[PDB]
Design a protein around this ligand. Structure first.
Ligand code: UPG
Length: 444
């Protein structure tokens, strides 16, 4: 007969998001923010000023913070941690005292920044840790943290058996020694994702349960992890060179283009670029090869963008960046020569594109193991077993993926996993359900 009703809805719930300022961490966070804004949430993405321009063009409320850094990996990272700890706390407190927006309910922060949980909890809001790597390699990091099995790795070969994982050869383990005297720092960075795993309010993984069933269930029983991937949309984020790349691809034959990208960070030696060049300029396919501006000088002196007719009569384009998700979904693309970063790997899965795996370090070695031997949607190159990958090896892997009956089955496998990733994020799918569990319980 008389009183007041209070309605908690997405439209009056405010979600803060803070990615690590690198594209493989920014991009999956942005995709997740877009899905959350689509459910009606007020979403504020926080990012460093030197990434603010990039994020501004791709896209949601946007907020910049100082880069926090002036310097090797450690000094860079400790300054970073100290600076963003204060600036994000300031943003949280300002949005508490505001009146236009709702006060923040939760901070979604990158899993490699676990101290951000103390920032969120210290300011009275929930924390959600977004893991940007698959379940299988993340569990390895946990076991390395637990200091149980010896992971130290030339007088023998070792094979490691961990619960709910296929046996892992030494080459299958996440690769840190590439970083030499910084291997400890990079190692610590990935291991420490688990330092406070039991105190995190939501543990988010950009993967889908059918892809990693055994290990996801294992993790789900230990922690209440929510697999919510792929966060990228199925068949928004507007990448640079979009019109140029789509026009070039629209003029190619179906299933005729090898797409080549080594991600946003990896840098191959100039001898390694030469092997890749000679392979691509003599194969029976067109090619689209992303060579970042800062990497152009490692190209063979033989050669913003550049067009080629190849020695096989085909066409090549070398470009400094591309809308990778749109490239992968283009009918012209036959396969994806990739460094096996997790976003690249999962984007290719969601697109049905088989892979040639040229992994460089951290999780890319483990991902390539799963791409070839578990999901069976690619072939991994063979290095002296850090070793150079020769043009004849790359050529062997192209002919296998694109010119053999085995390649036809890898393509069938990849269309099967493509359908499964689409079902995961559709209504009733495992990832849609876990993302809704996140959204719905935020309202409680
Ligand atoms: O021309 C290009 C090339 C790449 N991308 C995008 O850039 C991201 C690349 O990310 P990823 O494939 O994960 O590679 P990295 O840039 O190397 O990302 C780092 O962080 C990832 C997430 O933790 C790890 O999986 C990687 O191994 C690590 O190097 C993806 O969203 C791609 O779609 C583009 O949009 N255009």
């Amino acid at each position: 007969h008389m009183g007041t009703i209070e309605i908690s809805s997405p439209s009056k719930t405010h979600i803060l998001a803070f990615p690590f300022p690198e594209k493989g961490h920014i991009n999956p966070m942005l995709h997740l923010c877009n899905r959350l804004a689509s459910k009606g949430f007020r979403v504020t993405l926080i990012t460093t000023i030197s990434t603010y321009k990039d994020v501004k063009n791709k896209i949601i409320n946007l907020e910049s913070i100082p880069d926090g850094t002036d310097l090797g990996m450690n000094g860079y990272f400790n300054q970073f941690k100290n600076s963003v700890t204060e600036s994000v706390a300031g943003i949280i407190e300002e949005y508490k005292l505001g009146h236009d927006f709702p006060p923040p309910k939760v901070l979604i922060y990158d899993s490699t920044m676990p101290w951000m949980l103390d920032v969120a909890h210290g300011h009275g809001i929930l924390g959600a840790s977004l893991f940007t790597q698959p379940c299988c390699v993340s569990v390895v990091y946990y076991h390395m943290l637990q200091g149980t099995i010896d992971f130290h790795r030339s007088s023998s070969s070792k094979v490691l058996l961990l619960p709910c994982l296929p046996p892992l050869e030494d080459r299958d383990l996440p690769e840190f020694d590439y970083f030499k005297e910084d291997s400890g720092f990079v190692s610590n960075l990935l291991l420490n994702q688990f330092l406070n795993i039991d105190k995190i309010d939501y543990v988010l993984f950009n993967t889908f349960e059918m892809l990693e069933s055994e290990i996801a269930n294992w993790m789900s029983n230990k922690w209440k992890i929510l697999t919510i991937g792929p966060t990228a949309p199925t068949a928004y984020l507007f990448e640079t060179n979009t019109e140029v790349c789509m026009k070039w691809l629209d003029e190619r034959e179906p299933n005729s283009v090898i797409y080549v990208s080594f991600g946003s960070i990896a840098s191959l030696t100039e001898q390694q670029m030469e092997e890749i060049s000679q392979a691509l300029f003599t194969t029976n396919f067109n090619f689209l090869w992303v060579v970042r501006e800062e990497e152009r000088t490692k190209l063979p002196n033989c050669l913003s963008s550049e067009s080629f007719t190849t020695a096989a009569g085909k066409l090549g384009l070398i470009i400094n960046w591309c809308p990778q998700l749109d490239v992968l979904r283009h009918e012209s693309v036959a396969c994806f020569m990739t460094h096996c970063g997790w976003n690249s790997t999962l984007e290719a899965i969601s697109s049905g594109v088989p892979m040639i795996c040229v992994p460089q370090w951290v999780d890319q070695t483990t991902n390539a193991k799963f791409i070839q031997d578990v999901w069976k949607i690619g072939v991994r190159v063979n290095n002296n077993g850090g070793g150079l990958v020769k043009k004849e090896e790359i050529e062997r892997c192209i002919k296998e993926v694109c010119e053999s009956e085995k390649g036809k089955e890898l393509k069938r496998n990849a269309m099967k996993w493509k359908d499964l990733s689409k079902e995961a994020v559709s209504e009733g799918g495992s990832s849609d359900t876990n993302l809704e569990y996140f959204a719905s319980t935020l309202l409680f």
